[PDB]
Design a protein around this ligand. Structure first.
Ligand code: O0S
Length: 171
């Protein structure tokens, strides 16, 4: 059975319990925590690519008011659906399964200025999603997994001082 498990789930849940925030900038910012997964049940002999995208979690935006995240208005039009290709792609099943798969280099941005960046809307909530694509498959077999522990609000600056402090503590 194909199993894709979140690494450092306890660490993600500490951020999630405060409501997680990720900075977006012109030139793009790496995530903390970094999304990492363990994989079992691939064909060790087959070749696969790993893709990452971000799914809009709500039909409204968010605002931080009196130390609480609350509905903040109607959403902006959805950001272009940018996909990040894990730099190890394409690779054998055995490669993906022998050690955790880390998306350490993906950058989140609020400006379309190139560089394999992912564009997100500030004050909108996203859920990371990993796709496994089988190479050389006439059926283009793809299996996608969502990671609800890793949900965050995209921000130009931290709203929750507890998030600012958690980021410094664990990073
Ligand atoms: C049957 C089928 O739908 N196959 C498929 C294969 C690869 C695909 O490329 C892709 N690119 C970016 C994000 C996600 N997916 C999409 C779809």
């Amino acid at each position: 059975e194909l199993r894709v498990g979140l690494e450092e789930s306890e660490l993600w849940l500490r951020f999630k319990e405060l409501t997680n925030e990720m900075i977006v900038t012109k030139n793009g910012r790496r995530m903390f925590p970094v999304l990492k997964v363990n994989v079992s049940g691939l064909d060790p002999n087959a070749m696969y690519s790993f893709l990452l995208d971000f799914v809009a979690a709500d039909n409204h935006r968010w605002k931080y008011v009196n130390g609480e995240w609350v509905p903040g208005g109607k959403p902006e039009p959805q950001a272009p659906s940018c996909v990040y290709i894990h730099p190890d792609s394409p690779n054998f099943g055995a490669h993906w399964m022998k050690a955790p798969v880390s998306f350490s280099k993906v950058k989140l941005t609020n400006k379309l200025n190139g560089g394999g960046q992912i564009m997100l809307n500030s004050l909108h909530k996203y859920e990371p999603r990993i796709h496994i694509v089988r190479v050389g498959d006439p059926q283009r077999m793809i299996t996608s997994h969502c990671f609800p522990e890793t949900q965050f609000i995209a921000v130009t600056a931290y709203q929750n001082e507890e998030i600012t402090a958690l980021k410094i503590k664990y990073n």
